[PDB]
Amino acid sequence: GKGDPKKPRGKMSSYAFFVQTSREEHKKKHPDASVNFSEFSKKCSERWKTMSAKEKGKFEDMAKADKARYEREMKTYIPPKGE
Protein backbone atom coordinates (compact mmCIF):
# COMPACT_ATOMS: atom_id res chain seq x y z
CA GLY A 1 0.00 0.00 0.00
CA LYS A 2 2.57 2.59 -1.16
CA GLY A 3 1.76 3.62 -4.73
CA ASP A 4 -0.88 6.29 -5.27
CA PRO A 5 -2.29 6.88 -8.80
CA LYS A 6 0.28 8.66 -11.03
CA LYS A 7 2.06 9.70 -7.83
CA PRO A 8 5.90 9.44 -8.15
CA ARG A 9 7.93 7.36 -5.63
CA GLY A 10 11.24 9.08 -5.14
CA LYS A 11 13.46 9.06 -8.24
CA MET A 12 15.24 5.70 -8.34
CA SER A 13 18.97 5.58 -7.69
CA SER A 14 21.54 4.39 -10.21
CA TYR A 15 21.47 0.94 -8.69
CA ALA A 16 17.73 0.59 -8.57
CA PHE A 17 17.80 1.55 -12.23
CA PHE A 18 20.07 -1.36 -12.93
CA VAL A 19 17.71 -3.57 -10.94
CA GLN A 20 14.66 -2.75 -12.91
CA THR A 21 16.89 -3.57 -15.84
CA SER A 22 18.01 -6.81 -14.28
CA ARG A 23 14.36 -7.57 -13.60
CA GLU A 24 13.33 -7.53 -17.22
CA GLU A 25 16.38 -9.65 -17.93
CA HIS A 26 15.43 -11.99 -15.09
CA LYS A 27 11.91 -12.18 -16.35
CA LYS A 28 13.39 -14.30 -19.15
CA LYS A 29 14.00 -17.32 -16.87
CA HIS A 30 12.44 -16.94 -13.38
CA PRO A 31 8.74 -17.90 -13.34
CA ASP A 32 9.01 -19.20 -9.75
CA ALA A 33 10.84 -16.21 -8.31
CA SER A 34 7.89 -13.85 -8.79
CA VAL A 35 10.34 -11.18 -7.54
CA ASN A 36 8.79 -10.06 -4.22
CA PHE A 37 11.37 -7.26 -3.96
CA SER A 38 12.94 -8.91 -0.95
CA GLU A 39 14.84 -11.73 -2.61
CA PHE A 40 15.50 -10.42 -6.12
CA SER A 41 17.13 -7.03 -5.54
CA LYS A 42 19.32 -8.82 -3.06
CA LYS A 43 20.58 -10.74 -6.06
CA CYS A 44 20.84 -7.78 -8.46
CA SER A 45 22.78 -5.95 -5.80
CA GLU A 46 25.41 -8.64 -5.82
CA ARG A 47 25.34 -8.15 -9.62
CA TRP A 48 25.61 -4.31 -9.44
CA LYS A 49 28.12 -3.50 -6.68
CA THR A 50 30.45 -5.63 -8.81
CA MET A 51 30.28 -3.67 -12.06
CA SER A 52 32.60 -0.72 -12.76
CA ALA A 53 31.68 2.91 -12.28
CA LYS A 54 31.75 3.07 -16.06
CA GLU A 55 28.76 0.80 -16.45
CA LYS A 56 27.13 2.11 -13.32
CA GLY A 57 27.99 5.44 -14.90
CA LYS A 58 25.40 5.42 -17.68
CA PHE A 59 22.97 4.21 -15.07
CA GLU A 60 23.93 7.19 -13.00
CA ASP A 61 22.93 9.25 -15.96
CA MET A 62 19.60 7.51 -16.19
CA ALA A 63 18.77 7.89 -12.55
CA LYS A 64 19.76 11.50 -13.07
CA ALA A 65 17.41 11.83 -15.98
CA ASP A 66 14.70 10.40 -13.84
CA LYS A 67 15.58 12.94 -11.21
CA ALA A 68 14.31 15.58 -13.59
CA ARG A 69 11.14 13.66 -14.33
CA TYR A 70 10.39 13.48 -10.63
CA GLU A 71 10.32 17.26 -10.37
CA ARG A 72 8.47 17.51 -13.67
CA GLU A 73 5.64 15.27 -12.45
CA MET A 74 4.82 17.48 -9.48
CA LYS A 75 3.56 19.98 -12.02
CA THR A 76 0.37 17.86 -12.32
CA TYR A 77 0.08 15.73 -9.18
CA ILE A 78 -1.32 17.83 -6.27
CA PRO A 79 -3.88 15.58 -4.43
CA PRO A 80 -7.41 16.79 -3.52
CA LYS A 81 -8.33 18.27 -0.14
CA GLY A 82 -7.14 15.10 1.59
CA GLU A 83 -10.72 13.85 1.24
Curated annotation (Swiss-Prot):
Q: Where is this motif: Nuclear localization signal (NLS) 1?
A: 26-42
- Note down the stretches annotated as region Sufficient for interaction with HAVCR2: 1-83
Question: Can you tell me which residues bind heparin?
Answer: 1-9
User: Residues bearing N6-acetyllysine?
Assistant: 2, 6-7, 11, 27-29, 42
Similarity annotation? Belongs to the HMGB family.
**Free-text note on domains in this protein's UniProt record:** The acidic C-terminal domain forms a flexible structure which can reversibly interact intramolecularily with the HMG boxes and modulate binding to DNA and other proteins.
- Put simply, this protein is called High mobility group protein B1
Q: Please give the organism.
A: Rattus norvegicus (Rat)
* Record gene name: Hmgb1
| Covered residues, full protein | 2 to 84 of 215
